[PDB]
UniProtKB/Swiss-Prot annotation, chain A:
Residues of the full protein shown: 592 to 1018 of 1435
Consequence of changing residue 180 to S: Confers resistance to efavirenz and nevirapine
Outcome of mutating residue 48 to R: Confers resistance to stavudine
Result when mutating residue 174 to V: Confers resistance to lamivudine
Effect of residue 98 to I: Confers resistance to efavirenz, emivirine, nevirapine and trovirdine
Gene, per the UniProt record: gag-pol
Substitution effect: residue 96 to M: Confers resistance to delavirdine, efavirenz and nevirapine
Annotated effect of mutating residue 109 to S: Confers resistance to lodenosine
Name assigned to this protein: p51 RT
Effect of residue 141 to M: Confers multi-NRTI resistance
Outcome of substituting residue 63 to A: Confers resistance to lamivudine and stavudine
Span of domain Reverse transcriptase: 40-208
Mutagenesis or variant effect for residue 360 to I: Confers resistance to abacavir, lamivudine and zidovudine
Source organism: Human immunodeficiency virus type 1 group M subtype B (isolate HXB2) (HIV-1)
Length: 405, 537
């Protein structure tokens, strides 16, 4: 077709992110994939007068490798195109399926003036040789500008299946398509092939249940007898929960902690303490009132390492005002790898944010930058990449959330 | 001699214009010598005599072969030239090179001058040869080729070189060619006569594109003296390092000596600089003279002997295993050797004391493993199998319950003491039968006095006033007293947020003298339970 002019944001220069080192196997796969793309005119080699750069790497499913480009920096510096809105229905469905449509993009030429900004580098081993430089001639996968510039074409190709199915909902984000229905699994799945074959007919491809993502309740411990230690730990968590629910009281329990009693000594709960403990439980039976999502604010996702393979998390915009909270557990075959578990949690959580709000949250990761950067790619599978920062989990937040039900 | 090579389109930074600095007048000698040179360059088609038009200009100097040599200061032009793709700053490491039957090193002589400049950019490199008598115009020239000392030259030359080799590489898949600055290191497993034949092929393919080169005699022969190493065909070694010998050492002398010694620590084992570093205390000037103590003398004398040791390396075989072994030489200091077979090291190294506010040996080991791993992927595009001095249970007991995500690639245990262990472990529950200390601390952060103390269920109490102290310090000192005055088992109640940190991390090393004292005391107890409780009424 033709190319629509595209610019960076005022005063923004192009990305110059350094390429991280890669294993011999990933380099060989990238060399193979790129020599093919070059032959088809998708990408071309470039000269030294191009100083920009975006990092690239290689992910899997079983046999072949897929190329993944991190255009996070280019995306930020890329102008705005205000894409489609967000169907408040998609999130309310019953079953959503994700489809990779990145192949669609290779058929549309990228404005020649913008091409240089997509430069990337395949590194070598031991510095033996300079990297192999390339830039895109066509809409690249992962750049926010692609889905947008292909919108008119995507609506045109989805219209028939859409008019045919007034009920089902389709929502697009980056390279993926999120389709949901209320049908019956069998009819749902087979109804997807109908869509895929329709996509196959142009060039595109060769289970999530939103009605289960519900904020979890904090349940307090229950005991036959209570020791001084028991009462101190209960009082510490409640003292924190008060930051969320102002009606929680600890005066009665705290009165039971006067004196200097051995930590193991048993203390009889007075009637007052009894009531106070009961009012607090009653308050905790529901999420706190007043929390609503603001579109002019960033979405934040925090994760704590609970141990024994469990990982808790919260999504919010303002402190103590959670939009969603949950617990993700280690799955079959990760019993010795924290990194693999964290990457699985991030993707799962990022996916959830997309379905509900149409954007990805900013993550606070309880891991060291070096440890994360050296291995996160080993287990990534999404076409997209969220933003992230590394933190130092406060001992309390952790203690309170493992109290979840 | 010039090349048929396509030119690279170059541009000036957004907005600014070509340079216009005036020509620094020179004597009649230096002028006549420049005229000589610039006349020969005109013959070779390297520069072009120009006229009126060109408004730009760059200063030209004359320096001294015992003759004169041209020098053009492009400092200004450079700051007006666009940015280019960063020329690589990584240097291959001999531990990651594959052994070859034959190796020929070729340096492209007059690299730069041999490559054409973007025709639309030449005008910006105009310079002027003065004249004895002023007021007379002077000779005007501009560059037709990559100028020596110009910002873009290294990058444009490297790129060109790459384009010219692509075909040859595609035709000879088994041949390996290293590119470094304007040097090619070519290697094969062909029989010496065949190799020499393929080399001459390459040489003529380069000559074809204008790049001239060293033939068989006017060359370089092994062992090759490259970046501080000596490469032989069956192995490699490091160029011997020499420590001066004087009766009078200045502060500067000591700092350079300390540096060389520090570097040598990667390769040699027992290199020490403690007593020599002690020499810099309170120094008042670089040129100051510091007499050497006995210790410092012995230290230095001992290092000279170590440096005369034959440390050699071996090259990489992609058919054998890659293995790395680690040792804890001291708190926070580790040594490592990466090898393929017992006693044949590919490379060695040492990570200096990584101190801080607080960590634990198991943590530092983890970081050493990650640094070595990032290093291995760069060198060999692969991760080694580790041999760590730590019980599988210690690891499993730490990572299992540590608040931070952590991991070690595929490894194996090796009982080569001292092993890395957990120095202590807080109880998961209160201790039945052990005294319970209720500790508190507070102090005027202004007067820096204040106090901290405890009171137990058994009746024991105490309070100490601290002159010139702080908040966190009173809290910590509180905990410290309890640990000191208690028996082999204890329960400790504190409202300190910091102790809460000690619960989540359980460190064994720290900057703070206090924390240290606490750690020492925590390691002594047989059982310790630490509990945190909110402060206010
Ligand atoms: C008397 C026998 C003899 O010396 N044989 S030989 O042909 O000269 C020969 C053959 C291989 C080797 N070397 C090897 O096997 C391993 O080394 C190499 C393996 C492959 C390649 Cl392409 C180069 C080298 C280098 O020695 C080398 C590397 C770098 Cl980055 C700079 C310089 C630099 N500068 C040299 C040597 C040192 C000499």
């Amino acid at each position: 077709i033709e190319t629509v002019p595209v610019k960076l944001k005022p005063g923004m220069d192009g990305p110059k992110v350094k390429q991280w080192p890669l294993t011999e196997e990933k380099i060989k796969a990238l060399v193979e994939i790129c020599t093919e793309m070059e032959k088809e005119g998708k990408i071309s080699k470039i000269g030294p007068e191009n100083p920009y750069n975006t990092p690239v790497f290689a992910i899997k499913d079983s046999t072949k490798w897929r190329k993944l480009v991190d255009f996070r920096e280019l995306n930020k510096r890329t102008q705005d195109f205000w894409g489609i809105p967000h169907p408040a229905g998609l999130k309310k469905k019953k079953s959503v399926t994700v489809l990779d449509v990145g192949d669609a993009y290779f058929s549309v030429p990228l404005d020649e003036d913008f091409r240089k900004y997509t430069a990337f580098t395949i590194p070598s081993i031991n510095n033996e040789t300079p990297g192999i430089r390339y830039q895109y001639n066509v809409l690249p996968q992962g750049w926010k500008g692609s889905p947008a510039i292909f919108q008119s074409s995507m609506t045109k190709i989805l219209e028939p299946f859409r008019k045919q199915n007034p009920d089902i909902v389709i929502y697009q984000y980056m390279d993926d398509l999120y389709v949901g229905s209320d049908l019956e699994i069998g009819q749902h799945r087979t109804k997807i092939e109908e869509l895929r074959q329709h996509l196959l007919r142009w060039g595109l491809t060769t289970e999530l249940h939103p009605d289960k993502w519900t904020v979890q309740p904090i349940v307090l411990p229950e005991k036959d007898s209570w020791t001084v230690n028991d009462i101190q730990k209960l009082v510490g968590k409640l003292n924190w929960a008060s930051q969320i629910y102002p009606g929680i009281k600890v005066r009665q329990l705290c009165k039971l902690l006067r004196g200097t009693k051995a930590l193991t000594e048993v203390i009889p709960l007075t009637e007052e303490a009894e009531l106070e403990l009961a009012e607090n439980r009653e308050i905790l039976k529901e999420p706190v009132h007043g929390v609503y999502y603001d579109p002019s604010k960033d979405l934040i996702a925090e994760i704590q390492k609970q141990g024994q393979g469990q990982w808790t998390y919260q999504i919010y915009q303002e402190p103590f005002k959670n939009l969603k909270t949950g617990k993700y557990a280690r799955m079959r075959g990760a019993h010795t790898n924290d990194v693999k578990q964290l990457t699985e949690a991030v993707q799962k959580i990022t996916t959830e944010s997309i379905v509900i709000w149409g954007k990805t949250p900013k993550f606070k990761l309880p891991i060291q930058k070096e440890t994360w950067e050296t291995w996160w790619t080993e287990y990534w599978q999404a076409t997209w990449i969220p933003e992230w920062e590394f933190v130092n989990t406060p001992p309390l937040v952790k203690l309170w959330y493992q109290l979840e039900k | 001699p010039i090349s048929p090579i396509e030119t690279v389109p170059v541009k000036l930074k957004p907005g600014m214009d070509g340079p216009k600095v005036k020509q620094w007048p020179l004597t009649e000698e230096k002028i006549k010598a420049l005229v000589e040179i610039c006349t020969e360059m005109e013959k070779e088609g390297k520069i072009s005599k120009i006229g009126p038009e060109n408004p730009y200009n760059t200063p030209v100097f004359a320096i001294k072969s015992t003759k004169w040599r041209k020098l053009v200061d492009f400092r200004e032009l450079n700051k007006r030239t666009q940015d280019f793709w960063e020329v690589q700053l990584g240097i291959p490491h001999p531990a990651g090179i594959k052994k070859k039957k034959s190796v020929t090193v070729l340096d492209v002589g007059d690299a730069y001058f041999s490559v054409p400049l973007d025709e639309d950019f030449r005008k910006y490199t105009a310079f002027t040869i003065p004249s004895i008598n002023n007021e007379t115009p002077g000779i005007r020239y501009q560059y037709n080729v990559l100028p020596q000392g110009w910002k873009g030259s290294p990058a444009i030359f490297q790129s060109s070189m790459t384009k010219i080799l692509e075909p040859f590489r595609k035709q000879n898949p088994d041949i390996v060619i290293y590119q470094y600055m304007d040097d090619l290191y070519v290697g094969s497993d062909l029989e010496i006569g065949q190799h020499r034949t393929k080399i001459e092929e390459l040489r003529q393919h380069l000559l074809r594109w204008g790049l001239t080169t060293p033939d068989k005699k006017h060359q370089k022969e092994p062992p090759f003296l490259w970046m501080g190493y000596e490469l032989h065909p069956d192995k490699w070694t490091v160029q011997p390092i020499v420590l001066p010998e004087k009766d009078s050492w200045t502060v500067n002398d000591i700092q350079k000596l300390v540096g060389k010694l520090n570097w040598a620590s990667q390769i040699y084992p027992g290199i020490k600089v403690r007593q020599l570093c002690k020499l810099l205390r309170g120094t008042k000037a670089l040129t100051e003279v510091i007499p050497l103590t006995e210790e410092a003398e012995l230290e230095l004398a001992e290092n000279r002997e170590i440096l005369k040791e034959p440390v050699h390396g071996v090259y990489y075989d992609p058919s054998k295993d890659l293995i790395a072994e680690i040792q804890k030489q001291g708190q926070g200091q580790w040594t490592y050797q990466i090898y393929q077979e017992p006693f044949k090291n590919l490379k060695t190294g040492k990570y200096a004391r990584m101190r801080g506010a607080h960590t634990n040996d198991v943590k530092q080991l983890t970081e050493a493993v990650q640094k070595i791993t990032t290093e291995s992927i760069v060198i060999w595009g692969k991760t080694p199998k580790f041999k760590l001095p730590i019980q599988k249970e210690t690891w499993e007991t730490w990572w299992t319950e540590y608040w931070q995500a952590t991991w070690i690639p595929e490894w194996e245990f090796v009982n080569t003491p001292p092993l890395v262990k957990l120095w202590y472990q807080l109880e998961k529950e209160p201790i039945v039968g052990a005294e319970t200390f209720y500790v508190d601390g507070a102090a005027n952060r202004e007067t820096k006095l204040g106090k901290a103390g405890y009171v137990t269920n058994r009746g024991r109490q105490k309070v100490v006033t601290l002159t010139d102290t702080t908040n966190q310090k009173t809290e910590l000192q509180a905990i410290y007293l309890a640990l000191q005055d208690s028996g082999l088992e204890v329960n400790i109640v504190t409202d300190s947020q910091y102790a809460l940190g000690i619960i989540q991390a359980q460190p064994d090393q720290s900057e703070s003298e206090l924390v240290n004292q606490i750690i020492e005391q925590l390691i002594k107890k047989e059982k310790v339970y630490l509990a945190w409780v909110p402060a206010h009424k």
